[PDB]
Paper text:
The malaria merozoite protein apical membrane antigen 1 (AMA1) is critical for RBC invasion and is one of the most promising blood-stage vaccine candidates.
Additionally, we created insertion fusion immunogens by inserting RON2L into an AMA1 loop proximal to the RON2L binding site. Insertion fusion immunogens 2 and 3 were constructed by replacing several amino acids in the DIf loop of AMA1 with RON2L and a flanking Gly/Ser linker. Immunogen 2 lacks amino acids 260-PRYCNKDESKRNS-272 of the DIf loop, including Cys263, consequently disrupting a disulfide bridge.
Author numbering: 6 to 157, 174 to 201, 211 to 287, 293 to 340
The structure:
């Protein structure tokens, strides 16, 4: 008795390896100056996730609107600071943290998450509040998100104008201007190179988190020596894998006002019938079926292993 798949399938136990929402990650609370704020806390990167702002062509990685000029407009990212903390290229990150012996042998995504986590909302220097970030794998650039909300208590953090570094010797960094609208998370083709990163992304995410989809494989449940099919699935039409991953993402665990990672996080994509079969039970084995690709809401929407 027992399940021979246990070790290989640990990557797909979303409740354990990720532990928070996927579509909307607001799995923790942090105090800043006596006030509690929700913020993202998932331990895995979410590949291909971005935010779409309604009634706008403004990209969500545009810095948040500052000042009070007519037509002021912006996105979710940190505005300019002195010195400039965001966006920061991978090379800039490696050089500015060159004196921190612990950043060596951090991978690109982890380094971005830790850079974002360096800034403390200045009102509470003992605060556990850490901003999320988006890493652009194309331009190799890290964007700190000033607004942690993802759909619209909704994750809008403190209205901080000044920040202190967790890294010593401490530096204080303030915004160069004052900070001053419906939106939703999504996997868009234009987001395919992005990774959405909470403060909790683990150093070894490459080994414990799902990234690529599994070809010629179908998620199943281990039942007395056989890999049975998932008992209850929701079937949708999907012209290709990207559309199926987009759908799984839309239905996945969401903390929008805590999921703790529970939701419709997995999909079996039938490349022959062009059907996406989405379910909300953790899979415990894989079925050898040439027509299928197995995907999760966390996974890159296109890449296969």
């Amino acid at each position: 008795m027992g399940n021979p798949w246990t070790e290989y399938m640990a990557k797909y136990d979303i409740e354990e390896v990720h532990g928070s929402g996927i579509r909307v990650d607001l799995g923790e609370d942090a105090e800043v100056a006596g006030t509690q704020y929700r913020l993202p806390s998932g331990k895995c990167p979410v590949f291909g996730k971005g935010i779409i702002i309604e009634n706008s062509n403004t990209a969500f990685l545009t810095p948040v609107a500052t000042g009070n000029q007519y037509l002021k407009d912006g996105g979710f990212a940190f505005p300019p600071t002195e010195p400039l903390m965001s966006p920061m290229t991978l090379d800039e990150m490696r050089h500015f943290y060159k004196d921190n012996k612990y950043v060596k042998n951090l991978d690109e995504l982890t380094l971005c998450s830790r850079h974002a986590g360096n800034m403390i909302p200045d009102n509470d220097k003992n605060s556990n509040y850490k901003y999320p970030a988006v890493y652009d794998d194309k331009d190799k650039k890290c964007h700190i998100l000033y607004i942690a909300a993802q759909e619209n208590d909704i994750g809008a953090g403190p209205v901080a104008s000044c920040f202190t570094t967790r890294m010593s010797p401490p530096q204080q960094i303030c915004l160069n201007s004052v900070v001053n609208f419906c939106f939703r998370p999504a996997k868009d083709i234009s987001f395919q190179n992005y990774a959405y990163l909470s403060k909790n992304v683990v150093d070894n995410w490459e080994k414990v988190c799902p990234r690529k989809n599994l070809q010629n494989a179908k998620f199943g449940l281990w039942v007395d020596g056989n890999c049975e099919d998932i008992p209850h699935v929701n079937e949708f039409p999907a012209i290709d894998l990207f559309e199926c991953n987009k759908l799984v993402f839309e239905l996945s665990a969401s903390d929008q006002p805590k999921s703790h990672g529970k939701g419709y996080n997995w999909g079996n994509y039938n490349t022959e019938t062009q059907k996406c079969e989405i379910f909300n039970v953790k899979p415990t084995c894989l079925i050898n079926n040439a027509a299928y690709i197995a995907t999760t809401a966390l996974s890159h929407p296109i890449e296969v292993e």
